[PDB]
Structure 1
Amino acid sequence: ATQGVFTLPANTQFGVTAFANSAGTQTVNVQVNNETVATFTGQSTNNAIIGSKVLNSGGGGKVQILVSVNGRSSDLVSAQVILANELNFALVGSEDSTDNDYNDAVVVINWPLG
């Protein structure tokens, strides 16, 4: 039911990177424990990286991605993958229109860092 919400280990540094593939200017909001900590804005139809930041998951470890285009919330898809019981990817696609490529904004969260 929930898409684009992930429970990270507490107080963990993570990377968050957003790609754009749409005619529409993407706005990507990163909320940690229900507070906006990063906003990425930009327009590309060729997978430009419109932001890449290192954030901290805080006490609650809650990380939510929200995507909007010209004030309209995009439909999200997401999952988390763990490799070798250690390397974590939290993955978000988003759809701003009708073609259902779900790539309009793509967000990759990765941890651990360092």
Structure 2
Amino acid sequence: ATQGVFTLPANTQFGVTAFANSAGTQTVNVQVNNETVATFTGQSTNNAIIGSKVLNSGGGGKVQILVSVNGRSSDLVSAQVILANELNFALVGSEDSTDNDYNDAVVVINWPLG
């Protein structure tokens, strides 16, 4: 299945934060309504934050996460969880190799903000 794609409410501020746990340099691409709106590049084997930004979901609400290492697309896993029918987390793990820890870049999207 396609992973790393989420439908947000329209015109909503959201946070996106990425962590790295890999020997490979991670590139995290964030698209909103099919346009790249943030890129995070970094390397850590100890969960360093490689980016955190506030974005707007726009008219269409479509948010997509892609992750690559050395130009190769990582395999993604994702889900969305909603607490108290209001607090939302869109969650992505990614695997750049074959140990299958899925933590090589970890991305957390949260809304609402403010």
After TM superposition, the score normalised by the length of structure 2 is: 1.00
Name the SS of the counterpart of 2:45 in structure 1.
coil
Cα displacement (A) at 1:18: 0.1
After TM superposition, the score normalised by the length of structure 1 is: 1.00
Cα displacement (A) at 1:70: 0.4
Supply the RMSD in Å over aligned alpha carbons. 0.3
Structure 1: which 5+ runs fail to align? none
Q: Which has the higher strand share?
A: 2
What is the distance in 2 between the residues matched to 1:84 and 1:2?
Answer: 27
Cα displacement (A) at 1:64: 0.0
- Name the counterpart of 1:11: 11
What is the distance in 2 between the residues matched to 1:89 and 1:102?
Answer: 18
What is the distance in 1 between the residues matched to 2:53 and 2:71?
Answer: 23
What is the distance in 2 between the residues matched to 1:88 and 1:64?
Answer: 16
Cα displacement (A) at 1:5: 0.1
1:68-79 aligned at under 5 Å gives the runs: 68-79=68-79
Name the SS of the counterpart of 1:28 in structure 2.
strand
What is the distance in 2 between the residues matched to 1:44 and 1:31?
Answer: 23
What is the distance in 1 between the residues matched to 2:108 and 2:52?
Answer: 9
- Give CA-to-partner distance per residue, 1:46-102, whole Å, 9 cap, x none: 000000000000000000000000000000000000000000000000000010000
What is the distance in 2 between the residues matched to 1:102 and 1:37?
Answer: 24
Cα displacement (A) at 1:2: 1.7
- Name the counterpart of 1:67: 67
Runs of 4 or more above 3 Å deviation: none
What is the distance in 1 between the residues matched to 2:112 and 2:60?
Answer: 17
What is the distance in 1 between the residues matched to 2:26 and 2:4?
Answer: 16
Identity percentage over the alignment?
Answer: 100
Cα displacement (A) at 1:104: 0.1
Structure 2: which 5+ runs fail to align? none
Cα displacement (A) at 1:13: 0.1
